[PDB]
Amino acid sequence: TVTLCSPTEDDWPGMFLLAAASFTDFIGPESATAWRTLVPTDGAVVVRDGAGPGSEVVGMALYMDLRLTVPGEVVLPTAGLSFVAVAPTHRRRGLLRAMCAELHRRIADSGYPVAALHASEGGIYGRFGYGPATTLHELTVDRRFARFHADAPGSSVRLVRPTEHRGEFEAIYERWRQQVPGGLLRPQVLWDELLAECKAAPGGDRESFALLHPDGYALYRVDRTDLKLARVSELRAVTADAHCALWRALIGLDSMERISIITHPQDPLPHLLTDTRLARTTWRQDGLWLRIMNVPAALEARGYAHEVGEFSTVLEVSDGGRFALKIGDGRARCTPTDAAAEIEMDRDVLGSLYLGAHRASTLAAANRLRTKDSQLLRRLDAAFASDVPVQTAFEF
Amino acid sequence: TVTLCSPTEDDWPGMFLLAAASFTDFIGPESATAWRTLVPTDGAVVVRDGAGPGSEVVGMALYMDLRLTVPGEVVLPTAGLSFVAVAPTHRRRGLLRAMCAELHRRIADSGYPVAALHASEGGIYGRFGYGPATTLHELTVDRRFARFHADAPGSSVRLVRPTEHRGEFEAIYERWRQQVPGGLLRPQVLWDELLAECKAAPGGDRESFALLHPDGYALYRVDRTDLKLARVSELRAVTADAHCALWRALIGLDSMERISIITHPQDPLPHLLTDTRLARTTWRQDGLWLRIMNVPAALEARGYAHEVGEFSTVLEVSDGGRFALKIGDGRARCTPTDAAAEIEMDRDVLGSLYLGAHRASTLAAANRLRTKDSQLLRRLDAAFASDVPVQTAFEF
Amino acid sequence: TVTLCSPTEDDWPGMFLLAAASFTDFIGPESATAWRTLVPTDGAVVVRDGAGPGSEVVGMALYMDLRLTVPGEVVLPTAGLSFVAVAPTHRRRGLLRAMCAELHRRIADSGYPVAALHASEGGIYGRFGYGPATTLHELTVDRRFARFHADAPGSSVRLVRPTEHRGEFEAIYERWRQQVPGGLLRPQVLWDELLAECKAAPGGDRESFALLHPDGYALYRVDRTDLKLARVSELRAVTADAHCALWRALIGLDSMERISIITHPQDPLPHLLTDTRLARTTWRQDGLWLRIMNVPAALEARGYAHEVGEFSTVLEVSDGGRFALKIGDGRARCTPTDAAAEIEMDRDVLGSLYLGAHRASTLAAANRLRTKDSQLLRRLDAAFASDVPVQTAFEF
Amino acid sequence: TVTLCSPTEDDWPGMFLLAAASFTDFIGPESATAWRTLVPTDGAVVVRDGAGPGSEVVGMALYMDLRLTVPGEVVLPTAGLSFVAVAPTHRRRGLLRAMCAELHRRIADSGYPVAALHASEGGIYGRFGYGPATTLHELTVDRRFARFHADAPGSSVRLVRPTEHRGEFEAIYERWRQQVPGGLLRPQVLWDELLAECKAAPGGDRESFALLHPDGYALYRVDRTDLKLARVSELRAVTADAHCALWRALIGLDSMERISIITHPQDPLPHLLTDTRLARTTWRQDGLWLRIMNVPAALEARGYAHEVGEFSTVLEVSDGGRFALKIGDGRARCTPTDAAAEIEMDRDVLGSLYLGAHRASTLAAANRLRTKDSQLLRRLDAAFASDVPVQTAFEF
Ligand SMILES: CC(=O)SCCNC(=O)CCNC(=O)[C@H](O)C(C)(C)COP(=O)(O)OP(=O)(O)OC[C@H]1O[C@@H](n2cnc3c(N)ncnc32)[C@H](O)[C@@H]1OP(=O)(O)O
Ligand SMILES: CC(=O)SCCNC(=O)CCNC(=O)[C@H](O)C(C)(C)COP(=O)(O)OP(=O)(O)OC[C@H]1O[C@@H](n2cnc3c(N)ncnc32)[C@H](O)[C@@H]1OP(=O)(O)O
Ligand SMILES: CC(=O)SCCNC(=O)CCNC(=O)[C@H](O)C(C)(C)COP(=O)(O)OP(=O)(O)OC[C@H]1O[C@@H](n2cnc3c(N)ncnc32)[C@H](O)[C@@H]1OP(=O)(O)O
Ligand SMILES: CC(=O)SCCNC(=O)CCNC(=O)[C@H](O)C(C)(C)COP(=O)(O)OP(=O)(O)OC[C@H]1O[C@@H](n2cnc3c(N)ncnc32)[C@H](O)[C@@H]1OP(=O)(O)O
């Protein structure tokens, strides 16, 4: 009756239909490249309603091969789930759960240590062992009142057309994503897609003008309806001077009232200004989500805080076994075991901690991670913290 | 021309006038008590147009004796600036600056370690040495979709008339403030104020109600116009079990479409729900600001992370002296010095970093605090962190 | 523990709290009159948390002696549920279900053929055997353009002070409710209340005025905020001429832009105007709900369309026994039986038909009332219609 | 002075100017086809300013050949007026009255028993003998709270590209319109237009997708700006089951918050849900308007309610002559008479009653329909009713 499998040339039309209705943003021409370019052999799956070539496609999901920067500037190959969809005619038949379990096994066999996604909704993926792992705050600062603090660092920047500086953006982005927990390698095909979206579209987005610095850039587009608002689609800075030079320039768009940007909680913008309130937060939400596929691999992969002295504990993941984890001198040793578990937690929660965006003590407060040793809490809080604040790279 | 000095009895009326026209929330009857029983003798100063008694009151500013909890569960006597006002007629004449110079002087003399306030605007007090020290998050939660996580702790709480449980509120409050950095001793005169406010005002706010658990409580008043919005004026809890029980009951306001609360960034509410987002962040702003009056006094009083290995640096506060600072064992020694400064900052930067609500590394990136050692940045971040996350008490 | 009982004197306060925290419209002094003068001995019920006197009140519900005009102008004493509440701390533990079961046992033993309520939400009382039985249409008319048709009937009306003409209103309202299915007799305590609400409340509703006509009246008041909107709280007309006369005068309120009223689907107001669209439906929702307590009594009490030819059938009510139903000469005869059921439905469906507001054929398309014979659908459609279209009396 | 005549080939441009400047939705290319294809030679007329080829077009109006289904599954040839426009520079000189009189004579002279239109404004066509004959209810349903009742009927339907199933749709819509009062025959040239209007348009509507059942279908698209809102363009169902299963699917659009749709008052959606309120009515207005050209032909053409007993009366239509109307066994005999009229009414009232969308009892309360005999009034309500509730086909 219902089949779950890797597509063949026959399901393509099924997937194309399902994808278009399901994703408002999605279109056929732009989409064809992404999948060919970023999806491994059998990192894609479809649910067929029956059997026979041409059997209707009622579910799809696939993962891309991407490189994630975790704390300590390590890069972990990462499975990135995307284009997850069930047809509206088949809701609640276990199809999403089935598709994830299949994808997870393949990722596990492929030797990925983590998986990742951006959630359409907040309540879906926790059950499949994804915890939210970065935070995205919409930023809008009125530009009419902003003055830079006397301390702020800093003309060393140029207004340019984006299509004429792709190479510069690429270099800059590559340095940045290698330095920031959350960075993702952006392959040529996504520069293509990102680059094209700069050109104005009839009935859609306006032309986008870049701000270019040797160690940073910013792409910004005037809003479609509110002609007094500028939207920064992306800002990349490797140094604090470029970050501040770019902001002085954005603040400099005198024909604008407001500037808005998606950014991280540790963005220093507020502090560059005389009135930190001007860089107001207008939206707060989860960004990238992580699933730890291989506990030992994942915990040994990432660097830890040096500023916490050596300690040892047994961590138990609900129905993922037990682990002896040792962290000292910024490194971890994690191996399976059978000793009593000093601390226990669902798999999704471990993800939430993996990058440093969530403190273990808060989750503890919500009974999402348990233990009887208050001292161990503080140590994990400390250990798992990121020296460099986590940043979100691009949605996928 | 004009004249700065302590207010006599003849100056009262004039001040109330100035206050009512400066602060839309002011009231003549309600304040007389808080100002009178909480403002120390000669804690209040005014500026008069010319001389000869009863001169027109044009500037005013006073402070209150309050006890602030800081990291390590230590209470510091604190001076809380309030009813700072210059008349519309005398703006930008240095009255605010002069009134500040005067009170800081008195405050220094009188033996206060530091002075705190709440800021009407965002770019007034930094120059005077105040730095934003805690963060306010408005959470707006859609009650209808909320569902508690299986991990969530939890009937032990009863819907009560606030004026009937003063004692149990007060005791609960006392437990909370002695445990939460940012906690404030609540004066009896302020329990009066709060108890009185619960009553419905014709055309004003509606009656408040309370939810009472042995180890926590909540006051909530239905909003004046959105009859589908319950506003929580104050949520107080001392155990994870109370925090959750109270929320299980807030989500149980079935007639409400949403619940709103002013809380702190580390509030575990979101993690208690199967959907993290439902606890949407709506309004974000700075709350309690700190002016460190005595650097060694303050720095030595607060406890520090044990999970950071002992270390030594030389801190220079601009206009704040130079001290050799050493942290180890959760304690700090701070002693004058003329060695080269390894790290410098404006005085306000010290205050923001004092409760742990800001990371030294983020401020560094705005060049608000500067150093050439990166390992030290990390050490500060870790040292100044707070095992217990900072919470805000009550505006004043 | 959880005790379910008729409220004693010791409970009154417990209820005032539970009511005020449950219904924003609640007032203690005024509501005290209705339970006392309209609720039968043991027509009220409360749930107490535990044992001891003055235990806390965590659920409440009561039923007032309701007189109802059903089709045929027949008046049936009916139990009207009101002030149903379960505390937010005790929601989902079966208290509503428990309070209902009990009141129902009381209502049946007392002889009431049927029960009625107004539902706070739409998904509650179906499972208890109440169906939405009347429709409310909120009508907003932009009178700046309203012109009367040449056929519209019609200064035989007067502008009056409502509190000077209570008796005229009682007499008028008396004739009206005896004639219209949906009428309820309005007792003296309720007229006290209605008249009381006509006076201005500081920070509340403005003074109400009345339009008085020999065969009808309208009470209306200018809206609190929108000074160009008139709210008619009540319009009662015995004659088509009264209805038109009243609206002529309301369209005559030259200082208003809109007039709004809550009325029924067959209100002929639109057809009085040269442009039907001017009476725009700005709100539609279920109104009175009916639970048939005694199927034979209720069915025999109600009038039925004379035009439809006589006929017999056997109607089953889901777990409510089977029933021989004969309709002829606009009358019914209905007695328990054991014949095969020709038609069947959940008790609440019957409620929805009882007053002609919902077609048998419509309910059947949703499989809510089930029959193997089509002819019988159409016969039920014809029969249960009401010559006079059902209107809504007052909310309770 | 001015002239009224049939449009020659030289008037085509002027007509496109007038049409385009009087209708915001008008497009020259799409329209070309319907008028030539659907407008009969001579079914169109224009008014000119002056004489001499080239004169400017200041008035147009035409009719199309339509097939309307009326009670009894009977299909009347009908005349549909559309593209009625007087230039803003000639408003109020009688051009419409002049254009209507001419069209009506041609329409009668050609042997149509009934003309129909959609009214741009509600106070325009009544004077010309047209009366509102169907009702449109705009229903917005929040998808998230919707749960199907345990009784509801119902994977038997699938998500498809509309242009790949023209035949399946043509079939279904064909069975629909033959069964439902209000049905229209859809011309191949209009299926052309419907299919084309399904492709996305830059700055316009988004791609339409469809839901396809053996016995029904639904075309929907996500809204232009409201990305959480799904507009159903048209919904066709011939079985209750289809109607349900299609609604089971639209509710299955999880990415959406709201589905909206235009339908009729007797839509059973709400009764499919656990909460009838979820099927909120957000708009309600008259749809198809009818003018009975030929009283006997029309009254003898449509089937009547069987469940009313044979009866007789005298029906007098102002300006429409007098008739002995006799209804027996669901059929009507209507013949010329000079006997005393038992009931009188304007031509448009008869329009309104014709498809069963309005009750005579209600139009009588407006004194639009007049009789001294209430029993007679009940008999008309009963007889004119429809076994199948009337729905609206398409706007023309
Ligand atoms: C961009 C990315 O690819 S990530 C964003 C996801 N993409 C989309 O959501 C596209 C549109 N929406 C959909 O396609 C569907 O709603 C899907 C794919 C999310 C759901 O698939 P389904 O087959 O209906 O879910 P499935 O029944 O397999 O899941 C089972 C459980 O998940 C739950 N579930 C499914 N959707 C949701 C939801 N939106 N919120 C909470 N729980 C959910 C079910 O309640 C069920 O509960 P259970 O664990 O007790 O069994
Ligand atoms: C609850 C509490 O009491 S805290 C909130 C304070 N109360 C109020 O704001 C009441 C209404 N507003 C006011 O009373 C006035 O605006 C005050 C008291 C805040 C300002 O006093 P003033 O005398 O007008 O300012 P003054 O000239 O003395 O201050 C000097 C400096 O502060 C700066 N300053 C004063 N107000 C502001 C402001 N709103 N934003 C930024 N800078 C400001 C001046 O620009 C000036 O800058 P400078 O250092 O380069 O010279
Ligand atoms: C003016 C009047 O008095 S009439 C309007 C009703 N009064 C109110 O709503 C007052 C404010 N709200 C409340 O007091 C509560 O939410 C109540 C009284 C509606 C609910 O009572 P509760 O005791 O919490 O629910 P209870 O457990 O008794 O009900 C049982 C069933 O009804 C259902 N139910 C209760 N409330 C709702 C609701 N708002 N919507 C849908 N279903 C509901 C439950 O789902 C439960 O379902 P189940 O059969 O699967 O177990
Ligand atoms: C989709 C369709 O094709 S059907 C809908 C019609 N289309 C449009 O209306 C498009 C834009 N509007 C117009 O073109 C014009 O307003 C028209 C065509 C409706 C009116 O034509 P006119 O030539 O100005 O009116 P005309 O003088 O011929 O009609 C006479 C009477 O009708 C009345 N009338 C005309 N328009 C209206 C109106 N919008 N509302 C009420 N009455 C009107 C006049 O009052 C006039 O009064 P009277 O009965 O006392 O004599």
GROMACS .gro file of C-alpha atoms in nm, chain D residues 101-352:
model
  252
 1289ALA     CA    1  -3.479   4.891  -2.203
 1290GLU     CA    2  -3.316   4.804  -2.535
 1291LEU     CA    3  -3.144   4.489  -2.404
 1292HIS     CA    4  -3.461   4.376  -2.230
 1293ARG     CA    5  -3.674   4.416  -2.543
 1294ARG     CA    6  -3.418   4.216  -2.740
 1295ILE     CA    7  -3.397   3.964  -2.457
 1296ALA     CA    8  -3.775   3.919  -2.446
 1297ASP     CA    9  -3.809   3.937  -2.824
 1298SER     CA   10  -3.557   3.651  -2.843
 1299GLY     CA   11  -3.751   3.431  -2.602
 1300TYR     CA   12  -3.550   3.410  -2.280
 1301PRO     CA   13  -3.765   3.362  -1.968
 1302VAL     CA   14  -3.494   3.499  -1.740
 1303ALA     CA   15  -3.202   3.746  -1.732
 1304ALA     CA   16  -2.928   3.751  -1.466
 1305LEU     CA   17  -2.633   3.963  -1.363
 1306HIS     CA   18  -2.388   4.024  -1.085
 1307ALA     CA   19  -2.436   4.370  -0.934
 1308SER     CA   20  -2.137   4.603  -0.895
 1309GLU     CA   21  -2.350   4.794  -0.645
 1310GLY     CA   22  -2.662   4.689  -0.453
 1311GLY     CA   23  -2.896   4.979  -0.522
 1312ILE     CA   24  -2.871   4.982  -0.899
 1313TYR     CA   25  -3.071   4.701  -1.060
 1314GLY     CA   26  -3.381   4.653  -0.845
 1315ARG     CA   27  -3.556   4.939  -1.029
 1316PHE     CA   28  -3.506   4.741  -1.350
 1317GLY     CA   29  -3.679   4.424  -1.224
 1318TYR     CA   30  -3.372   4.232  -1.097
 1319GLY     CA   31  -3.371   4.084  -0.744
 1320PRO     CA   32  -3.098   3.918  -0.536
 1321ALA     CA   33  -3.150   3.545  -0.593
 1322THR     CA   34  -2.851   3.374  -0.433
 1323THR     CA   35  -2.638   3.443  -0.124
 1324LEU     CA   36  -2.258   3.420  -0.094
 1325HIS     CA   37  -2.102   3.344   0.242
 1326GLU     CA   38  -1.731   3.408   0.264
 1327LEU     CA   39  -1.605   3.152   0.508
 1328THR     CA   40  -1.267   3.169   0.673
 1329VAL     CA   41  -1.163   2.871   0.877
 1330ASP     CA   42  -0.866   2.850   1.109
 1331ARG     CA   43  -0.702   2.523   1.000
 1332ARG     CA   44  -0.507   2.462   1.321
 1333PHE     CA   45  -0.805   2.412   1.554
 1334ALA     CA   46  -1.021   2.217   1.309
 1335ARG     CA   47  -1.100   1.859   1.411
 1336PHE     CA   48  -1.350   1.642   1.226
 1337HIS     CA   49  -1.655   1.532   1.418
 1338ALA     CA   50  -1.680   1.162   1.496
 1339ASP     CA   51  -1.979   1.148   1.262
 1340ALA     CA   52  -1.805   1.298   0.962
 1341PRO     CA   53  -1.764   1.082   0.652
 1342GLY     CA   54  -1.414   0.962   0.565
 1343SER     CA   55  -0.665   0.932   0.064
 1344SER     CA   56  -0.947   0.882  -0.185
 1345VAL     CA   57  -0.848   1.218  -0.332
 1346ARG     CA   58  -0.513   1.346  -0.455
 1347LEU     CA   59  -0.306   1.662  -0.505
 1348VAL     CA   60  -0.268   1.732  -0.881
 1349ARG     CA   61  -0.167   1.997  -1.135
 1350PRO     CA   62  -0.501   2.149  -1.246
 1351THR     CA   63  -0.401   2.168  -1.613
 1352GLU     CA   64  -0.340   1.792  -1.620
 1353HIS     CA   65  -0.699   1.706  -1.542
 1354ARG     CA   66  -0.921   1.939  -1.747
 1355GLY     CA   67  -1.143   1.646  -1.845
 1356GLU     CA   68  -1.185   1.521  -1.488
 1357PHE     CA   69  -1.288   1.872  -1.381
 1358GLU     CA   70  -1.516   1.933  -1.677
 1359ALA     CA   71  -1.695   1.609  -1.592
 1360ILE     CA   72  -1.746   1.686  -1.226
 1361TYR     CA   73  -1.847   2.048  -1.274
 1362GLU     CA   74  -2.092   1.928  -1.538
 1363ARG     CA   75  -2.262   1.687  -1.295
 1364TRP     CA   76  -2.257   1.958  -1.031
 1365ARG     CA   77  -2.428   2.230  -1.236
 1366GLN     CA   78  -2.704   1.998  -1.362
 1367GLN     CA   79  -2.797   1.914  -1.003
 1368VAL     CA   80  -2.768   2.246  -0.816
 1369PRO     CA   81  -2.999   2.547  -0.841
 1370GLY     CA   82  -2.768   2.823  -0.960
 1371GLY     CA   83  -2.554   2.593  -1.172
 1372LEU     CA   84  -2.421   2.737  -1.498
 1373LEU     CA   85  -2.306   2.557  -1.806
 1374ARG     CA   86  -1.938   2.632  -1.834
 1375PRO     CA   87  -1.832   2.700  -2.192
 1376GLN     CA   88  -1.514   2.550  -2.332
 1377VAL     CA   89  -1.397   2.908  -2.376
 1378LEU     CA   90  -1.441   2.962  -2.000
 1379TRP     CA   91  -1.258   2.643  -1.906
 1380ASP     CA   92  -0.984   2.789  -2.122
 1381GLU     CA   93  -0.985   3.104  -1.909
 1382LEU     CA   94  -0.997   2.906  -1.583
 1383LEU     CA   95  -0.701   2.688  -1.682
 1384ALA     CA   96  -0.484   2.982  -1.791
 1385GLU     CA   97  -0.562   3.171  -1.471
 1386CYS     CA   98  -0.396   2.880  -1.287
 1387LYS     CA   99  -0.038   2.971  -1.383
 1388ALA     CA  100   0.146   3.206  -1.148
 1389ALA     CA  101   0.164   3.570  -1.249
 1390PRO     CA  102   0.454   3.805  -1.159
 1391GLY     CA  103   0.312   4.055  -0.912
 1392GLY     CA  104  -0.017   3.868  -0.930
 1393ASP     CA  105  -0.171   3.548  -0.797
 1394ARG     CA  106   0.039   3.244  -0.718
 1395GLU     CA  107   0.013   2.904  -0.886
 1396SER     CA  108  -0.317   2.726  -0.823
 1397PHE     CA  109  -0.306   2.362  -0.718
 1398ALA     CA  110  -0.604   2.127  -0.708
 1399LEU     CA  111  -0.752   1.849  -0.498
 1400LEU     CA  112  -0.916   1.577  -0.707
 1401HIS     CA  113  -1.175   1.325  -0.590
 1402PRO     CA  114  -1.385   1.085  -0.796
 1403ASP     CA  115  -1.689   1.301  -0.711
 1404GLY     CA  116  -1.548   1.648  -0.650
 1405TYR     CA  117  -1.254   1.884  -0.682
 1406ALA     CA  118  -1.105   2.199  -0.534
 1407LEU     CA  119  -0.881   2.469  -0.675
 1408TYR     CA  120  -0.676   2.667  -0.427
 1409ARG     CA  121  -0.372   2.895  -0.414
 1410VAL     CA  122  -0.172   3.054  -0.132
 1411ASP     CA  123  -0.250   3.425  -0.094
 1412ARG     CA  124  -0.040   3.700  -0.264
 1413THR     CA  125   0.069   3.866   0.058
 1414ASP     CA  126  -0.077   3.659   0.344
 1415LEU     CA  127   0.159   3.361   0.330
 1416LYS     CA  128  -0.034   3.168   0.596
 1417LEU     CA  129  -0.361   3.193   0.405
 1418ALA     CA  130  -0.507   2.966   0.142
 1419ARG     CA  131  -0.777   3.084  -0.097
 1420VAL     CA  132  -1.003   2.820  -0.243
 1421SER     CA  133  -1.101   2.962  -0.583
 1422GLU     CA  134  -1.390   2.727  -0.645
 1423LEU     CA  135  -1.514   2.408  -0.485
 1424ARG     CA  136  -1.720   2.148  -0.665
 1425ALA     CA  137  -1.873   1.847  -0.495
 1426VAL     CA  138  -2.158   1.619  -0.597
 1427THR     CA  139  -2.155   1.370  -0.311
 1428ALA     CA  140  -2.151   1.455   0.057
 1429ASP     CA  141  -1.848   1.224   0.090
 1430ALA     CA  142  -1.654   1.417  -0.172
 1431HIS     CA  143  -1.733   1.747  -0.006
 1432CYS     CA  144  -1.607   1.605   0.320
 1433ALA     CA  145  -1.292   1.429   0.200
 1434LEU     CA  146  -1.192   1.744   0.011
 1435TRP     CA  147  -1.232   1.945   0.330
 1436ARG     CA  148  -1.035   1.680   0.510
 1437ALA     CA  149  -0.756   1.765   0.272
 1438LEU     CA  150  -0.770   2.145   0.275
 1439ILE     CA  151  -0.755   2.121   0.654
 1440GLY     CA  152  -0.443   1.910   0.584
 1441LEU     CA  153  -0.255   2.212   0.450
 1442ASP     CA  154  -0.038   2.243   0.762
 1443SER     CA  155   0.185   2.524   0.633
 1444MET     CA  156  -0.135   2.731   0.629
 1445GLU     CA  157  -0.313   2.905   0.913
 1446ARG     CA  158  -0.638   2.978   0.737
 1447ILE     CA  159  -0.837   2.848   0.440
 1448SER     CA  160  -1.092   3.086   0.294
 1449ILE     CA  161  -1.370   3.010   0.048
 1450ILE     CA  162  -1.682   3.159  -0.110
 1451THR     CA  163  -1.984   2.936  -0.071
 1452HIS     CA  164  -2.356   2.919   0.009
 1453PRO     CA  165  -2.543   2.949   0.341
 1454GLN     CA  166  -2.632   2.575   0.355
 1455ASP     CA  167  -2.273   2.460   0.329
 1456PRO     CA  168  -2.236   2.174   0.578
 1457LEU     CA  169  -1.870   2.251   0.661
 1458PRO     CA  170  -1.936   2.379   1.011
 1459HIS     CA  171  -2.133   2.065   1.095
 1460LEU     CA  172  -1.833   1.854   0.990
 1461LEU     CA  173  -1.623   2.011   1.267
 1462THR     CA  174  -1.606   1.955   1.644
 1463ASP     CA  175  -1.638   2.334   1.680
 1464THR     CA  176  -1.891   2.485   1.439
 1465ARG     CA  177  -1.747   2.831   1.501
 1466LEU     CA  178  -1.419   2.741   1.323
 1467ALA     CA  179  -1.614   2.774   0.999
 1468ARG     CA  180  -1.637   3.148   1.060
 1469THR     CA  181  -1.836   3.368   0.824
 1470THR     CA  182  -1.622   3.666   0.735
 1471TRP     CA  183  -1.842   3.807   0.461
 1472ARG     CA  184  -2.193   3.772   0.325
 1473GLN     CA  185  -2.356   3.935   0.023
 1474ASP     CA  186  -2.596   3.881  -0.266
 1475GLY     CA  187  -2.455   3.695  -0.566
 1476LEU     CA  188  -2.669   3.620  -0.871
 1477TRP     CA  189  -2.954   3.862  -0.940
 1478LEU     CA  190  -3.261   3.758  -1.143
 1479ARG     CA  191  -3.512   3.933  -1.360
 1480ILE     CA  192  -3.806   3.714  -1.459
 1481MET     CA  193  -3.874   3.815  -1.821
 1482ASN     CA  194  -4.171   3.575  -1.853
 1483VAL     CA  195  -4.375   3.504  -1.541
 1484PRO     CA  196  -4.570   3.193  -1.656
 1485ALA     CA  197  -4.279   3.036  -1.851
 1486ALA     CA  198  -4.058   3.091  -1.547
 1487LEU     CA  199  -4.307   2.980  -1.282
 1488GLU     CA  200  -4.408   2.671  -1.481
 1489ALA     CA  201  -4.046   2.582  -1.559
 1490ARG     CA  202  -3.917   2.526  -1.205
 1491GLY     CA  203  -4.001   2.228  -0.988
 1492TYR     CA  204  -4.165   2.287  -0.650
 1493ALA     CA  205  -4.159   2.133  -0.307
 1494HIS     CA  206  -4.358   1.813  -0.291
 1495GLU     CA  207  -4.405   1.848   0.079
 1496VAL     CA  208  -4.659   2.126   0.042
 1497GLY     CA  209  -5.017   2.028  -0.031
 1498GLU     CA  210  -5.180   2.138  -0.356
 1499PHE     CA  211  -5.313   2.494  -0.337
 1500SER     CA  212  -5.420   2.797  -0.542
 1501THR     CA  213  -5.378   3.171  -0.542
 1502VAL     CA  214  -5.374   3.480  -0.757
 1503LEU     CA  215  -5.031   3.628  -0.813
 1504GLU     CA  216  -5.001   3.982  -0.937
 1505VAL     CA  217  -4.666   4.120  -1.047
 1506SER     CA  218  -4.664   4.496  -1.065
 1507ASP     CA  219  -4.613   4.574  -1.433
 1508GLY     CA  220  -4.616   4.197  -1.482
 1509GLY     CA  221  -4.985   4.116  -1.518
 1510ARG     CA  222  -5.199   3.888  -1.302
 1511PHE     CA  223  -5.193   3.510  -1.270
 1512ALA     CA  224  -5.379   3.217  -1.128
 1513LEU     CA  225  -5.098   3.017  -0.977
 1514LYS     CA  226  -5.171   2.657  -0.880
 1515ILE     CA  227  -4.911   2.421  -0.736
 1516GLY     CA  228  -4.973   2.046  -0.736
 1517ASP     CA  229  -4.742   1.747  -0.697
 1518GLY     CA  230  -4.434   1.968  -0.720
 1519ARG     CA  231  -4.555   2.138  -1.038
 1520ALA     CA  232  -4.713   2.473  -1.115
 1521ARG     CA  233  -4.982   2.591  -1.351
 1522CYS     CA  234  -4.972   2.969  -1.403
 1523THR     CA  235  -5.234   3.133  -1.628
 1524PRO     CA  236  -5.374   3.476  -1.721
 1525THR     CA  237  -5.652   3.603  -1.489
 1526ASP     CA  238  -5.842   3.914  -1.390
 1527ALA     CA  239  -5.970   3.766  -1.062
 1528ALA     CA  240  -5.889   3.963  -0.749
 1529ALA     CA  241  -5.519   3.943  -0.665
 1530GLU     CA  242  -5.444   3.746  -0.347
 1531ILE     CA  243  -5.082   3.856  -0.343
 1532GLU     CA  244  -4.892   4.136  -0.514
 1533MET     CA  245  -4.525   4.221  -0.564
 1534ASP     CA  246  -4.273   4.399  -0.786
 1535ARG     CA  247  -4.089   4.208  -1.053
 1536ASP     CA  248  -3.765   4.187  -0.861
 1537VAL     CA  249  -3.924   4.038  -0.550
 1538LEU     CA  250  -4.020   3.749  -0.774
 1539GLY     CA  251  -3.657   3.723  -0.880
 1540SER     CA  252  -3.550   3.692  -0.517
   0.00000   0.00000   0.00000
